[model samples]
Target: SFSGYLKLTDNVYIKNADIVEEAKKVKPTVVVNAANVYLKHGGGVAGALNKATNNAMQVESDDYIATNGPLKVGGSCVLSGHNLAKHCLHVVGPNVNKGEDIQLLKSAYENFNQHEVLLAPLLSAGIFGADPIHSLRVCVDTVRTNVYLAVFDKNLYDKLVSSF
Candidate 1:
């Protein structure tokens, strides 16, 4: 039987094969790709969602803590951006202070990925109209210290790390 690959979307393709036939060719489990692409706008809010269990880790005017809706901490104030660190909490480094806020990120990574957690972020919600590079820098810098299993788009990794 003749078989051919059909181009679908710009970067997607399909092969002509029967469902049963294809099933047999499937791998036992999905594997992470070495070179992956991650796209997120720059300077988005770090953690902004308050679920029942997973609270929003916010950086208030003075410190970083989980914000309780309608229940404000003494020093808590709103910052810009719209990122919810559900399975992962993202934060920026302490500004020339090396403050306690950085510790929260480390704790989140140690706890989250250890249990095989999943996380997603709202990338386009750029903070103060920051660019993707800047936003991603915050992410990469924040998470790299603690998480061991992280996959970045090959291009993004190259671009982000090359300058440093």
Candidate 2:
């Protein structure tokens, strides 16, 4: 039961949580974690850290938004729409082609030595091209346990059928 061509939807609010309210819910013992790992150079407007910050109150400072693509503006966190957590560890991996991004990401989490780690892989129009499903496979196959992919586009359905 499938139909229709691909329709790209943008600026979709994945979740709207009250930061102030949510912060109060966390227990003092709860550990705040952050890591900015990437495979490619630029992830358009929204990078890994940006997505992590708005959803969770953790800052991944080592995260790097390259100076390429339309998203990169001023050698800073120009992709501000996704309010990635503040005052957290930002781990920026090397540029694309070398695959250092993934290594750094693994190292970053391993260094934390936390029991439970929630990873938000922002593999959409930014780093993994426009094919969300391809991106999903890449994220899942590469990352170790405790890594999770946030599938955004339904177009991936077609991708899966063709690939599978």
lDDT of each: 0.26, 0.30
lDDT of 1 by residue, 85-156 (tens): 212223222221212242233322222233222222212212322233553444444432221222124454
What range of 10 consecutive residues in model 1 has the weakest lDDT sum? Answer: 30-39
Model 1 clash pairs are: 36-153, 37-153, 42-131, 42-132, 42-135, 43-127, 43-135, 45-81, 45-82
Clashing residue pairs, candidate 2?
53-84, 53-85, 60-90, 61-89, 61-90, 62-90, 62-91, 62-92
Looking at model 2, residue 37 earns an lDDT score of 38
Model 2, span 1-164: residue lDDT tens: 11121222221111122222222232212212222233222333233333434533222232333433221210122222223222222223222343334433333333223323322333332342333444334434443434322233345444543553
For candidate 2, give the lDDT: 0.30
